[PDB]
Amino acid sequence: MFDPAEKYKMDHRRRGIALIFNHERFFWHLTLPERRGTCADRDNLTRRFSDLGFEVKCFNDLKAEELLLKIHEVSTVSHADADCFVCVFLSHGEGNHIYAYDAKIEIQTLTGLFKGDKCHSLVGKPKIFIIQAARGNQTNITEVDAASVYTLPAGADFLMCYSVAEGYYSHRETVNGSWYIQDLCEMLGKYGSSLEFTELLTLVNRKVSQRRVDFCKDPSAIGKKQVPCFASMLTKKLHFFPKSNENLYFQ
Amino acid sequence: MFDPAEKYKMDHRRRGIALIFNHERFFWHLTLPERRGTCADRDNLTRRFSDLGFEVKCFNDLKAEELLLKIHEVSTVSHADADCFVCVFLSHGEGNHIYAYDAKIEIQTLTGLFKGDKCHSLVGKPKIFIIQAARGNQTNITEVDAASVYTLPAGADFLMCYSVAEGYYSHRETVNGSWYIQDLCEMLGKYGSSLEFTELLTLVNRKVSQRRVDFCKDPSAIGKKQVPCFASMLTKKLHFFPKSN
Numbered sequence A: 001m002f003d004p005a006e007k008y009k010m011d012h013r014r015r016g017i018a019l020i021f022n023h024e025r026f027f028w029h030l031t032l033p034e035r036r037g038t039c040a041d042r043d044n045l046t047r048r049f050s051d052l053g054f055e056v057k058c059f060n061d062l063k064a065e066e067l068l069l070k071i072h073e074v075s076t077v078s079h080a081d082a083d084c085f086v087c088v089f090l091s092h093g094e095g096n097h098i099y100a101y102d103a104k105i106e107i108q109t110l111t112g113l114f115k116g117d118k119c120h121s122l123v124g125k126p127k128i129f130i131i132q133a134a135r136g137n138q139t140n141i142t143e144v145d146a147a148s149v150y151t152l153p154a155g156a157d158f159l160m161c162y163s164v165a166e167g168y169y170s171h172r173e174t175v176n177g178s179w180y181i182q183d184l185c186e187m188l189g190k191y192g193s194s195l196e197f198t199e200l201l202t203l204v205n206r207k208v209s210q211r212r213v214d215f216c217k218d219p220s221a222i223g224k225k226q227v228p229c230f231a232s233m234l235t236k237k238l239h240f241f242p243k244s245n246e247n248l249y250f251q
Numbered sequence B: 001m002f003d004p005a006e007k008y009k010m011d012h013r014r015r016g017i018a019l020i021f022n023h024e025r026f027f028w029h030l031t032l033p034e035r036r037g038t039c040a041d042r043d044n045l046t047r048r049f050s051d052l053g054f055e056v057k058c059f060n061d062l063k064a065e066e067l068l069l070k071i072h073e074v075s076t077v078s079h080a081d082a083d084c085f086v087c088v089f090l091s092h093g094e095g096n097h098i099y100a101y102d103a104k105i106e107i108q109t110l111t112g113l114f115k116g117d118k119c120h121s122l123v124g125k126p127k128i129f130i131i132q133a134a135r136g137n138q139t140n141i142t143e144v145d146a147a148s149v150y151t152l153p154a155g156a157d158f159l160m161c162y163s164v165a166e167g168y169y170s171h172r173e174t175v176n177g178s179w180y181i182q183d184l185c186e187m188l189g190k191y192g193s194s195l196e197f198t199e200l201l202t203l204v205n206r207k208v209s210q211r212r213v214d215f216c217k218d219p220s221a222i223g224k225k226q227v228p229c230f231a232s233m234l235t236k237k238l239h240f241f242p243k244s245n
């Protein structure tokens, strides 16, 4: 019965939830810079994921306790009537940690909450994480952070998506937002509803790698390329085809 | 004129080289077990990559010096007339290291040799690494190792492919070979020449995740699932369509 073109089942009543944890400022005693532009990212993401049928829930500058609570909440709610789950971090990070407002959180513990064992409603459905996180270096300027967050995998049917890989650099325009998120969102706009999601993420890798970094306003920001990646542990093709909502309840 | 279905150019004279570093035994003072079965893997890989047009070059139980030499050799030869480059490690590993016969080698330094800067002939062409490596635990039995090798990325136009992810377990049958390699090679056989390579690797993730581990001859090998992954830094679709000659 084995099928090389098998797709994830994306015919549930609702598409599912897209969390967006958005971090602009941090507690003084962490000594991390403002991520001026992260709001463009949040809004651009919010729009593109909405037009794909996600209930988008944004959360600005949560402390560790608040963040762990809101994400544990979402893991224990039923996704039984949902196609998939998306979770997005716009912050600083280091190694296997993302930064909340007040301290770092182990990424494995956030993905761990949606592992088949602990969230039955999502077993066999895609769990996509998107992570725009790097090291805080210290009108519209382009700021550049060094890659810092390990490009971890997660578990069966997870897709981990990363702004930048080891040895490369992450770019954020202070008005237009992160290079990764701009190009992710451009591709979501044009191709989200037709293309297989990893096919799309590959276009994002081209779009971002192709961005030139030879003629730069800061002389020290020259020759710092951005190459994003993704770690697929998906088992099927993933498409976000428009859902039929013609005389149906999808709330 | 940006194109969402853009493919890597796979119309060069030759397909390219597939290295296979194959490690069965290790120096006494490392205390790592025989990988009985790794020869099935090597032969199965050799066949499937040959039928796709690769010049396959296997190397059995090289010491660190020998391995670094053979792979530096290959990085400095011209691949100008080649579609891509494949490199395969069948060994033990830990963190960001693969085991040669006599000591561990930093994976970044092996991938580093094919980074655009250092190997011009391969810039903009896919560089695929496939890594069947885990922690040596100590007729046809199924042996089970804990995942140990970090699922690293590499650079523009690299595809890093991994037998197993953090928290999961890697299986090798002592005659039939590694679960990952069996299912990789089955899929290469059936679909290698038609399917996009990441589409294929995804089938391998299904095939291997689906392998049941509830009714096992060893009671202690029960409930140890295998989930492989891949870290794509590819920028285009990758197909191994039959070359005309």
Ligand SMILES: Oc1cc(F)ccc1CNc1ncccc1-c1cocn1
Residues within 6 Å of the ligand: A150, A151, A152, A153, B147, B148, B149, B150, B151, B152, B153, B165, B166, B167
């Ligand atoms: O993927 C894994 C597999 C395992 F078996 C064990 C652990 C990991 C996660 N580690 C990483 N993953 C990707 C890039 C870097 C790391 C890294 C570097 O240092 C510490 N971690």
